[PDB]
Amino acid sequence: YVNDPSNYQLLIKNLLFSPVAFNPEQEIVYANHRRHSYKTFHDRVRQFANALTKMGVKKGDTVAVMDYDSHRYLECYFAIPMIGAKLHMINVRLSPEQILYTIDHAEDDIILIHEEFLPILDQIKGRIDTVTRYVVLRDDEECEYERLLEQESTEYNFPDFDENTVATTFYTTGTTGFPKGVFFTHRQLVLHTMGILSTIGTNASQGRLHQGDIYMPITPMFHVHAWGLPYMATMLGVKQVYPGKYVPDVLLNLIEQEKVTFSHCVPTILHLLLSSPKSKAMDFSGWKVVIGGAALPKALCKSALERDIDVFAGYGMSETGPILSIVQLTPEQLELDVDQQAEYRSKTGKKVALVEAYIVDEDMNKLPHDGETAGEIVVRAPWLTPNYYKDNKNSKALWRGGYLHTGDVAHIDDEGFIKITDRVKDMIKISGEWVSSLELEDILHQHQSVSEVAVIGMPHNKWGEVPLALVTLKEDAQVTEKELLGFAKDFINKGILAREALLLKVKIVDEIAKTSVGKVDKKELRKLHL
Amino acid sequence: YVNDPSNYQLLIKNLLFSPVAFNPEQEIVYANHRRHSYKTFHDRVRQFANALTKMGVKKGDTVAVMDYDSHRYLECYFAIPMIGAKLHMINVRLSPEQILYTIDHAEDDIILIHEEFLPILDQIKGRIDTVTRYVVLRDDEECEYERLLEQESTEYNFPDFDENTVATTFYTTGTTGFPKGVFFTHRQLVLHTMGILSTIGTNASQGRLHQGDIYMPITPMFHVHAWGLPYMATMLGVKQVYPGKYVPDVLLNLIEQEKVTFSHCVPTILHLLLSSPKSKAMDFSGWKVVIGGAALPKALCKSALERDIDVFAGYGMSETGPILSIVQLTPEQLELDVDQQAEYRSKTGKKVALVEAYIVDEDMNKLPHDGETAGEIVVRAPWLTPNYYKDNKNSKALWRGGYLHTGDVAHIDDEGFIKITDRVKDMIKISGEWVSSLELEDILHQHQSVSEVAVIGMPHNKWGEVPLALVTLKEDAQVTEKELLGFAKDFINKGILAREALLLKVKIVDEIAKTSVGKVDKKELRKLHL
Amino acid sequence: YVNDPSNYQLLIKNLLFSPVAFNPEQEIVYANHRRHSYKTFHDRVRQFANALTKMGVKKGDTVAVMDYDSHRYLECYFAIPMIGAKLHMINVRLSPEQILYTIDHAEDDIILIHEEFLPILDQIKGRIDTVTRYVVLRDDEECEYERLLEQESTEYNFPDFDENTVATTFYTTGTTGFPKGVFFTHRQLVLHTMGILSTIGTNASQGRLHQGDIYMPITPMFHVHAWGLPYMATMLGVKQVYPGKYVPDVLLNLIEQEKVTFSHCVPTILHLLLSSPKSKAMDFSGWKVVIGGAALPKALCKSALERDIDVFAGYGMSETGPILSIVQLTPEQLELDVDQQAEYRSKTGKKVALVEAYIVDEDMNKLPHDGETAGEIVVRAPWLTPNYYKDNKNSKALWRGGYLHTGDVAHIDDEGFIKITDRVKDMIKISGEWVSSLELEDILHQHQSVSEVAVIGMPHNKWGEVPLALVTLKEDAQVTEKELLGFAKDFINKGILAREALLLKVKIVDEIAKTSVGKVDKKELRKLHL
Ligand SMILES: Nc1ncnc2c1ncn2[C@@H]1O[C@H](COP(=O)(O)OP(=O)(O)OP(=O)(O)O)[C@@H](O)[C@H]1O
Numbered sequence A, B, C: 001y002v003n004d005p006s007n008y009q010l011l012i013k014n015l016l017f018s019p020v021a022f023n024p025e026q027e028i029v030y031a032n033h034r035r036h037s038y039k040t041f042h043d044r045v046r047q048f049a050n051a052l053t054k055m056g057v058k059k060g061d062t063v064a065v066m067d068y069d070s071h072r073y074l075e076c077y078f079a080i081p082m083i084g085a086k087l088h089m090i091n092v093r094l095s096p097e098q099i100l101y102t103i104d105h106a107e108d109d110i111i112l113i114h115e116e117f118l119p120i121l122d123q124i125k126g127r128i129d130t131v132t133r134y135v136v137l138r139d140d141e142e143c144e145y146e147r148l149l150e151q152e153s154t155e156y157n158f159p160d161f162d163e164n165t166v167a168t169t170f171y172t173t174g175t176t177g178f179p180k181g182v183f184f185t186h187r188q189l190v191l192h193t194m195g196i197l198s199t200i201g202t203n204a205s206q207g208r209l210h211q212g213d214i215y216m217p218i219t220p221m222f223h224v225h226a227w228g229l230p231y232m233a234t235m236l237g238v239k240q241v242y243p244g245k246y247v248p249d250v251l252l253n254l255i256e257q258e259k260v261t262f263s264h265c266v267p268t269i270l271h272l273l274l275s276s277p278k279s280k281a282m283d284f285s286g287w288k289v290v291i292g293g294a295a296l297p298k299a300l301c302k303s304a305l306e307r308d309i310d311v312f313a314g315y316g317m318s319e320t321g322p323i324l325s326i327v328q329l330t331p332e333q334l335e336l337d338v339d340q341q342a343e344y345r346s347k348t349g350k351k352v353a354l355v356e357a358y359i360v361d362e363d364m365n366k367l368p369h370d371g372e373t374a375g376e377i378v379v380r381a382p383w384l385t386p387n388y389y390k391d392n393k394n395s396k397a398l399w400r401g402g403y404l405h406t407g408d409v410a411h412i413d414d415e416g417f418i419k420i421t422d423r424v425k426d427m428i429k430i431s432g433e434w435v436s437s438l439e440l441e442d443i444l445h446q447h448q449s450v451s452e453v454a455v456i457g458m459p460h461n462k463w464g465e466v467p468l469a470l471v472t473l474k475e476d477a478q479v480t481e482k483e484l485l486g487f488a489k490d491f492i493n494k495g496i497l498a499r500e501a502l503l504l505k506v507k508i509v510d511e512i513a514k515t516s517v518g519k520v521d522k523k524e525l526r527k528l529h530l
């Protein structure tokens, strides 16, 4: 690659070595395990580049990582792409067969794997063909990664290549029959970092990430680049605490002891942290979790705002950066009380710098932002995957009409607030309308005798795709289908016929099929019952 | 231009229509003249695009602007580049012959000119060949720009082109025999905006620009893109106040009445504002001027910090964005008293996100950042001009060794603070060393009987390029050359022989040649005396 | 595609419409189901092209077929490639998960499927994404293919395209973790047809295919193009009988009634046909089966030659045409008695026209054709797959050293006879030598008390990869491991130490893991026991 120095390329090494701030005595902390400064972190990154080069890793190669959140994962975020290789982030919560599929599909050359994921490997290792080396990672001195790093020099000259070289890849299960692979370039990751820093860095006084913060992730580093936050923290040169495996007591201790002020997580882990007993005597009033990944419920938001936590939501997916929108509150909206707060903070948010985000219908017509007209969200941004790796027909559907299709159904306010209402697939196509299964499920779950409910589409010749319910009861709880029907038929203010209560078809089921991720399997649910 | 929607191009229209924040009721204020909201501003930008298209302006064309800071200049910053044309910003403080040269060199098609610069035009209009239309701008209803805009529609579909299309150009006098033309692309301006927003937006608590600020420029909009601040303010959607022609009373009233909180200026105007009588009864403790363009003196910095002004310096040039470095203070450095503050705040600063900035010697060897070793600053950044327009030999010297040569001589601290010490040309090459003329000039001007001094290089056969002084005395003030020599020879702690006092050669001169910009002409000074 | 008529392209349509012989009253017979002449067959091929075009099938598309051997499969062999589409032949003996994988990997647009394979589909249909139409095939009038064909015209102008356009694809399980996809072009299939017709057509008086023969396949049409024989039969214009689903009574009746004279099959089906009772009163002395796919055993060859059957073997794989070599006997070798005959006829054969076929060692050195030195067979021919579809690392290993690696271990005679001795993977790497597991297995199975044996590689620190046995006993049969050891240790004339009897390690096991194809799983066998 011959480059003229005038033609600036946006590479991840510029992110590491041309930061917003660099303090060589700031520290990276791994749990109660290890602790070292930013000068050691830079040295270790160069050593890791030396070690990878010694193993025969080249510019086009793929190195796969399977570990928890640690300093080693942070070093892989930089060293692998800076040598020109491609970081394949393995989703360890998939089943072994899916994991084997993604390793075969990506064609990894080396696998870095934690010792306590060696049992998943034991049952798929006979079928792996492309992998020449396995490096076992441990939390003590017996780590093979530490031994590899120790015998290398702290010197390395990182190459210059085109900014459009692929940097990372990971696989998303979604709604297809096999996992799909997304990928991003150096330019896209660099631009995601600066775009989000421009958006949440400039907020007047709520929900801002700045150079005085202390960062600790609580959302996996293999999911969406950990929302890109490990890159933005490094760019800001702030203290970074890595908890390892998520255990609520350990997490609460790390927050108290290392004085964490910025995190991301998902509603389940936040509920676990707040409902822990050890959390009752803890000061939380300097902490700023952003909750992405699932809809933040208003009840959880309210419970968190009474502990003085600056909780807010964000939106994104595997195909999109991940960040597309965040909730940011004006000085007047900060004057409201906890209920009007909890309403705003639970929204999907407003779109970030350099994002388009229209709501459209099935034929790609743009719907008004009136506050109630719903449609599918389609986006244009500087950091979207152009297609699925090694895939054509699914890629065409991803980018239909010149926009990226998120698969989520929402309405937008006239002031720009986005409220996701359901999924495109999950929408019931009764008669001629589209009711959301989410609101009906939420109504039914409000019952004092219900633990879970799913809503699916059964058919009808007269009203087409019509609603149906599965309900699961609690300890020694028995409420019939007809009673549930009446309870639902109570409510008012809905569409269709009357307010949609003649097709509820509620059924009580011991269990609802759930994936390995813990999300109810709507595909198998509609396979079994019909 | 055919683009696939996947391939995202970084254009200025995305800056206008994909902001960090958009409030359609936020306002743009022109002095006491006009006031309208952001919704009117977007409408006017589309109208201006319609009007330019009607005049035959095409993608490659050049529109030249000659006005003060106003809303019209802000509209030209967006409309001209968004149609694909090139905005040539005319430096109205140059002499008429230089202005004529730059108009001929750039080959402008249309000229927008304020009525009170029509006398400069009257004497160069006979020699302009390429210009087909002159639009006269006025501060009342008789403006030709307002009439052109009124008869257009508020609708316009802005094209998509390559991100490497040139957006702006302007000319810098510098050290050559004619002005040199620099140019920037859409990608470079967009990246300058996000890089600076990432740097100064994320500061913990001092010197930050955010979405709650009110912006008013006090540095010309034709100089360096006004430090890029008009783009960053628009991106943040904050209130923007344009003062027009700089008069200190009007400026102080605008600060008081519109509640301005962020500005940029140069030391002379700041001294005028602080030394005004009307400024004695004014609250200044929410104002954050950044002083670039010349070295901020410690005495001015101290006088400003006792009025509670958040004053800080920044560094950049016509060839470089303009921003390369800014002073940003840590929470501990904010605990210091006004003297240790005034020391830090007057430094050139630390480099911003995505900037390299080495100090080097004459043969391109990198000098240590020990705190006192000086050398020329050379930089790499995403927003540097690749060459001078229509120029080859000077362009080769600009990028010698694969780095951009700034022409400034500085040392860097081990913590990253840059202190500019002099110019490369102005360095005295006595014997084998390089003394700075700036420190000697500063010493000599400390005298209670001196109004100004210049230091230049006279020659010597024995000590080569040796120092020489020109001094100008005050009202009825007479101090001989020998007395000045003794006064200088007093001081201690310097290099060369003894502490360099045998070649001072001080001469008293009624005047020192000054350019139209007001900067002492070192070239003519060394032409006259030798 | 613009072609000059001078530049002749080798396309499959030339095979159909420029044959060696065309008799429009010759007939295609499907079992006891249907019967029509070659003029109807050409008309139906044009109708099928019309129907496929009406469904939106284009030049690059993929149509997948899942049926038994019938006239419809023969029509798919021509119509799909002649329109420029790609025929994906689905292996219905794979498990449903593998079938689903190959459908996803190939990205089929339409699926033609027989009604009695609809239960495999029912359990993978929820996970198929790319398929827009399913055409159900039946053996009566209710076939959807017949209905589609009836409403089309018998006219169609077939395009001219490049001869290097892909025509067919199918997937082979082999030794990797997922099935691999091979593909062939029009040129390759045409050249395979003429090369084999040149080889076996010109034989003096044994084992020749000519224009007076009657052809009936007994090896699946989805396996290797049915050894390319359906193309060669059509080219010769001979009568073609398709039996449908292989049932020995039906097959014997078809041979007797339609007077079949040329077939291909595998040893198991031939053993079933010869050992049937209905076969005892059948004249077989005009029939010429070629046995490929597995090694033809000498005992089966001898039993077939006493019924006066012209039995001979052939060699090929999914990656190679399939044909690479056939046994062809000289007039002197036809004078030998049934034992010396059965020896020659069971060999792998000699290579066919335009085939290279060297035996090599692990470092790609060419071994002598002395008659006993063994090595891996590597080939060059006009009809080999250049790589695996969507695959890089496995493709590199397929073509290592500039030759295609078959994975089989054989020695070659000085007269050119090839005798395959084992697989490359199955070779035991004891000490420094390579014994074949096949000869040891054959010895052990000779025991009067054994039903099956497998030999695998257990390890040893002293002799490296050393032999091990699994044995299964017959009805109420019990012979210990030590007795088996002694029985084996009897024999003489072998290598290593003594004659290799100290590491036999025989174990009696109720069952030996078998794949869905019925081939013993050596991979799982070495996974379980070690
Ligand atoms: N703030 C939010 N509110 C509501 N839904 C959200 C929010 N953030 C993310 N989501 C949902 O999670 C999706 C993120 O995409 P992702 O890559 O994680 O797919 P996925 O986790 O693999 O889905 P699945 O488990 O079904 O296979 C979004 O498309 C959206 O459906």
Ligand SMILES: Nc1ncnc2c1ncn2[C@@H]1O[C@H](COP(=O)(O)OP(=O)(O)OP(=O)(O)O)[C@@H](O)[C@H]1O
Pocket: B172, B173, B174, B175, B291, B292, B293, B294, B295, B296, B313, B314, B315, B316, B317, B318, B319, B347, B348, B406, B407, B408, B420, B517, B519
């Ligand atoms: N904070 C600062 N401290 C010291 N010098 C500075 C600072 N900022 C800018 N400068 C000086 O002003 C220069 C900016 O470049 P610029 O485009 O303005 O050239 P110029 O104004 O046309 O020079 P001239 O008047 O001599 O022709 C810098 O190279 C540097 O010399």
Ligand SMILES: Nc1ncnc2c1ncn2[C@@H]1O[C@H](COP(=O)(O)OP(=O)(O)OP(=O)(O)O)[C@@H](O)[C@H]1O
Pocket: C172, C173, C174, C175, C291, C292, C293, C294, C295, C296, C313, C314, C315, C316, C317, C318, C319, C347, C348, C406, C407, C408, C420, C517, C519
């Ligand atoms: N005449 C023959 N003698 C011995 N072995 C043969 C003969 N013909 C074919 N074979 C074997 O069958 C192989 C043909 O390749 P093929 O495409 O059928 O792989 P496969 O059937 O899918 O193997 P597997 O079941 O293990 O997955 C040859 O490589 C060879 O091992």
